[PDB]
Design a protein around this nucleic acid. Sequence first.
RNA 1: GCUGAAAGCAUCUAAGCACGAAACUUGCCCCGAGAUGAGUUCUCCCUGACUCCUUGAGAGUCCUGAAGGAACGUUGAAGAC
RNA 2: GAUGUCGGCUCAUCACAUCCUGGGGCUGAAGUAGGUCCCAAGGGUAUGGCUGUUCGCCAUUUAAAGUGGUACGCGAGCUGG
RNA 3: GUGAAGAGGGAAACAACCCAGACCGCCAGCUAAGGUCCCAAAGUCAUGGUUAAGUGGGAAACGAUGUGGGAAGGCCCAGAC
Lengths: 176, 38, 209, 54, 142
Amino acid sequence: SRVAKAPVVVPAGVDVKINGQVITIKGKNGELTRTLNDAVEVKHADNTLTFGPRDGYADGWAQAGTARALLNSMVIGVTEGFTKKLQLVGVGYRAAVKGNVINLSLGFSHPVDHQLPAGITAECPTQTEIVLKGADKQVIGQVAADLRAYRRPEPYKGKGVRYADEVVRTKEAKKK
Amino acid sequence: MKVRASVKKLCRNCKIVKRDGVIRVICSAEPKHKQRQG
Amino acid sequence: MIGLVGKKVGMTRIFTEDGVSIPVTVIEVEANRVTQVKDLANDGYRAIQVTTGAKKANRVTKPEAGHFAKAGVEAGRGLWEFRLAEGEEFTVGQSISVELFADVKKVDVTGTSKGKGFAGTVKRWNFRTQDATHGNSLSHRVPGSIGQNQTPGKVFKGKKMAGQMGNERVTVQSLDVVRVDAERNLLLVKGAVPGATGSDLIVKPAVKA
Amino acid sequence: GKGKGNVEYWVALIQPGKVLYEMDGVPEELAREAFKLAAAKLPIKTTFVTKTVM
Amino acid sequence: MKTFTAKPETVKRDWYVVDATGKTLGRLATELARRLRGKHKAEYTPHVDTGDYIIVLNADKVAVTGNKRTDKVYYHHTGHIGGIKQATFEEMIARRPERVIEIAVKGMLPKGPLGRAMFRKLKVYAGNEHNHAAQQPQVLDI
RNA sequence: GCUGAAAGCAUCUAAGCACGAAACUUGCCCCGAGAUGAGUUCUCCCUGACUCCUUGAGAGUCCUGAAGGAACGUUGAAGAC
RNA sequence: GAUGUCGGCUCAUCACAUCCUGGGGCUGAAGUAGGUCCCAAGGGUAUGGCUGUUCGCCAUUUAAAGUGGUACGCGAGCUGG
RNA sequence: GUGAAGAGGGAAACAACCCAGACCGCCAGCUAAGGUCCCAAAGUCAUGGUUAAGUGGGAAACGAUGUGGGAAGGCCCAGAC
Ligand SMILES: [Mg+2]
Ligand SMILES: [Mg+2]
Ligand SMILES: [Mg+2]
Ligand SMILES: [Mg+2]
Ligand SMILES: [Mg+2]
Ligand SMILES: [Mg+2]
Ligand SMILES: [Mg+2]
Ligand SMILES: [Mg+2]
Ligand SMILES: [Mg+2]
Ligand SMILES: [Mg+2]
Ligand SMILES: [Mg+2]
Ligand SMILES: [Mg+2]
Ligand SMILES: [Mg+2]
Ligand SMILES: [Mg+2]
Ligand SMILES: [Mg+2]
Ligand SMILES: [Mg+2]
Ligand SMILES: [Mg+2]
Ligand SMILES: [Mg+2]
Ligand SMILES: [Mg+2]
Ligand SMILES: [Mg+2]
Ligand SMILES: [Mg+2]
Ligand SMILES: [Mg+2]
Ligand SMILES: [Mg+2]
Ligand SMILES: [Mg+2]
Ligand SMILES: [Mg+2]
Ligand SMILES: [Mg+2]
Ligand SMILES: [Mg+2]
Ligand SMILES: [Zn+2]
């Protein structure tokens, strides 16, 4: 509908390849490639790519809209790149980064080594925070989700990992 | 989680959504409102 | 990896200097001659065939004698096969000795256990007997019931009954290797291995681990 | 056998269209809620009807 | 007089090869069973196996519609009590791909010694290469 | 759960991706090619004549008995046989 | 013109509406220990005193001492209270 | 009405259900119920819809932004949701 009809914008210095239903964006932050659904049609006007449902398929518009959103995210990732910051709120909860291994100390009786995927880069601006960068929104979200699932926020004190954008809703330990 | 044959919206935030052909109520506000149909 | 073929010499003990008596089984693991190498291209699986001991000249039949003479090895008393891991590679005629277990801590010994004959249910499956008295009649050790009733009206497969016990291939796993004396061709494992004295054992490295 | 049984409870056979309960003097939405609550206790499908001239 | 009946010693059987890629399982199997039984011949005879040898290639690329790929369940009882094993279509394709086509066709062929003799004439291959180049199989565009 | 529209938001799903239990398929052990779909690989053995015809994947005579097996005997921590 | 009828012993086998162990949601879940619901049938699942009793009570354990179907399983298997 | 005292075809099997009342023979044709992808004779028939649940091929109150059709109604380019 509205999202499906809203075209993307192709900035300067990015390459847009289209072979069959596979589409490819080579930006400055790297390379990305996605095989869209068969019900999807991507045109040109090589400045604003636009999307339409192919004839003969059911949802059609849903597939077109989801492909448009995917390519919006891909262009953002290859031009500016997505970045997510996580905090470790607790007693002596710490994170370190060695190349592509994030070491978590979370009260476990064993260190937690998390291997970053292919093109995701981690940093520790502070000993209690992680900053993740990458050109794939889905990949970076998956990495952050796994890191949080190491130690989801407690409802009683908010300890554990968390996203910055997250309002950890607490409740006081019951009286009596 | 409430596994009940009749799932309804229990507040302004409860949202009906069907996952895997199963009706569920997901509530951002009160986690007591998490229901599924069974 | 590969194992070896040994003979169960018997069972003894080893007194360690700290006054502990390890009950060990002695295996006469002499040299094993590789008579054949089976590869994927010709056989669909990687294995070696080994022989051990020595057999009577007039009792080695002509086909078996020819099979050994193809490898160029003296006719042993049998033939066993060992599957190969991808890294290892053996050649025909190679004599593999008990020094193969120099750095192996636990082994698996497989052999034919002792044949107890036709063993009843009480021996074979540890069924409990019935009252030796209190009125019992001709049923002091019988299996009792063997089914339900009209439903299912049949006895199920795999039911436990009397039959032949022992005399079958049994593998005792993760036996500690105490001593590996290559100069006398001996392997000493901590524990009891299947079969009677003089039987043939196949000793492989540990697989559980 | 041995005769009929003893009277245990009294029923009122209901045929489609029978207007069971009627209500007046309340707002329409509150009447709907009250009738929903009542119908939840009955073993027959119901519906909400209004007064008409004929 | 008496109606003509085919004589098993004088029947003529041909070799066909069918590439089962992208086809629907059951709709391939009905034609396979038809030609194995010999229902496509003027001299069809119910008590004579007059069918044709058929070689099914690419048995792992057979297709099924709907959710049958992850929801069709092949049950079988080992004969030991409690031994009701089962395997889904995808698991059975992964482990023993040609058994899918074989069961599909064996369910449609008549039950009996002649049915078994008919099913002996079906050659189902997981891959694309087939040994029987000596029999000069014909390309049967089912 | 991630990404994600249908439904400008939202949403674990409708495409796509991830995690997930002593259950399932394996991994461990035993049987197992009568698996009549009767598989594979080594090795060994036998390469003489002659009639008849119902000329058939025919029948028969002479000479020849191979590898091997079986039988018998002494027997076994194998065994009711 | 006969299908032996309670309980006990031996032997079991299946269901899941699960007693334990295994994975989860919510909690009036601080922690330990719970309550409740969802998934799960691989394995395990008391010994005695009383009584003919299954049952129940009681003693003492255990991770648990599951509920059921199987002619209220099982007398051409035993007993006969 | 049927069975009893009625065969035959259909309902998988199925006295009493649907079709139909066996004098005998035929390697002749047309049909009833019921059916025409293979078992298994006959449409992988034509036209237009619906379902995405293996529904079809067991079951209720009740619940639900599944999807299809219809008749309205409310707010809307002083640009509405
Ligand atoms: Mg013995
Ligand atoms: Mg006892
Ligand atoms: Mg006695
Ligand atoms: Mg969105
Ligand atoms: Mg009688
Ligand atoms: Mg359950
Ligand atoms: Mg099971
Ligand atoms: Mg298992
Ligand atoms: Mg008791
Ligand atoms: Mg006493
Ligand atoms: Mg007593
Ligand atoms: Mg009984
Ligand atoms: Mg019982
Ligand atoms: Mg009894
Ligand atoms: Mg008796
Ligand atoms: Mg009996
Ligand atoms: Mg009896
Ligand atoms: Mg008495
Ligand atoms: Mg009468
Ligand atoms: Mg009749
Ligand atoms: Mg009549
Ligand atoms: Mg009839
Ligand atoms: Mg019926
Ligand atoms: Mg019939
Ligand atoms: Mg008549
Ligand atoms: Mg006609
Ligand atoms: Mg037909
Ligand atoms: Zn709510």
